[PDB]
C-alpha cells in the first residue's frame, strides 16, 4: 500500500487550498509477520521503548472519554486505584 | 485498631497510639516517633475479602486517621508559634480526604500561618479559596480583619 495525507483549509471558503502529500509506502508479507517485526504480542512486549507501539494501541484502541466530579470531597484514591489497584507504570 | 486510635486521637493519647502502630509494624520503627509518618507506614492487610460486610473498612479509617491527625498537628504547632511547620502538615491535610468544611478550615490555618510570618499576598489566596469553597466564611473575614490590623489597612478591616 501506499500513502496519501490530504490536508484542506477550513477559514477560505472558496474551497482554495487542497494541498496532499504522499508520505511513504507500506511493504508486507507472511515471512516479516512469522518473525513477529511490527506485531504487539502481549506479555513480553511490556517494556514500550519504541513509543510507535504505544501509538499503535492509542490509534487501534476503544477510546472513552469521562469527567469525575466529587462535590463534597477532593479527589486523590485515583493515583492508589492507578498505581496500587490497577498497578500501572 | 483503626477504632481504637480514634478514641486514643479523640481522647490525646497520642504517645499510646504511636505506641500501638510501633508495635503492629515492625519495632525496628522505633524512632519514628512522628504519627503521619506511621499512619501511612500502617497497611491494611487485604482489599476485605469476601468476609461479612461492614458500615467502614481499614483504608476508609486510614484516610480519616491521616487527615485528622494532620489538621490537629497543624493547630498545635500555629498556636504554640511555628507557623512554619505548619505548612507540611496543613499540605498533607488537602492531600487525602478532606470534606470541604476541613478544606475551609486548613484555608483559613495556611492564611493564619502566613499572616503570622508577615506574607500578606499568599494568606489572601488561601482565605479567597475559603470564602468560595465554604458555607460558613465567618472564620476567613475574621483572619482577614486581623491581617488589615497588621497592615493599617482600617477601612478595609472595618468593612471586612
Known amino acids: 500500500c501506499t500513502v496519501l495525507l490530504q490536508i484542506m483549509e477550513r477559514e477560505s471558503g472558496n474551497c482554495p487550498k487542497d494541498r496532499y502529500v504522499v508520505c511513504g509506502r507500506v511493504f508486507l508479507s507472511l515471512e516479516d509477520l512469522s518473525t513477529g517485526k511490527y506485531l504487539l504480542t502481549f506479555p513480553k512486549k511490556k517494556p514500550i521503548e519504541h513509543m510507535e507501539d504505544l501509538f499503535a494501541l ?11 466530579t466529587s462535590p463534597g470531597y477532593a479527589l486523590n484514591s485515583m493515583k492508589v486505584w492507578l498505581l496500587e489497584h490497577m498497578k500501572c507504570e | 485498631v483503626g477504632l481504637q486510635a480514634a478514641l486514643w486521637l479523640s481522647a490525646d493519647r497520642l504517645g499510646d497510639l504511636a505506641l500501638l502502630l510501633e508495635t503492629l509494624n515492625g519495632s525496628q520503627s522505633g524512632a519514628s516517633k512522628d504519627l503521619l509518618l506511621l499512619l501511612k507506614t500502617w497497611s491494611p492487610p487485604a482489599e476485605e475479602l469476601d468476609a461479612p460486610l461492614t458500615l467502614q473498612d481499614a483504608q476508609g479509617l486510614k484516610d480519616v486517621l491521616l487527615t485528622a491527625f494532620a489538621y490537629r498537628q ?16 496543613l499540605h498533607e491535610a488537602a492531600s487525602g ?54 497592615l493599617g489597612d482600617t477601612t478595609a478591616e472595618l468593612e471586612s
Open chain 1, 58 to 68: 492509542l490509534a487501534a484502541f476503544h477510546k472513552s472519554c469521562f469527567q469525575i
Open chain 2, 97 to 150: 480526604l478532606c470534606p470541604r468544611p476541613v478544606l475551609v478550615q486548613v484555608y483559613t490555618a495556611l492564611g493564619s500561618c502566613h499572616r503570622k510570618m508577615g506574607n500578606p499576598q499568599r494568606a489572601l489566596l488561601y482565605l479567597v479559596a475559603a470564602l468560595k469553597e465554604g458555607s460558613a466564611w465567618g472564620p476567613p473575614l475574621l483572619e482577614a480583619s486581623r491581617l488589615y490590623q497588621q
Open chain 2, 74 to 89: 497543624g493547630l498545635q504547632e500555629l498556636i504554640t508559634g511555628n507557623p512554619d511547620k505548619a505548612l507540611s502538615s
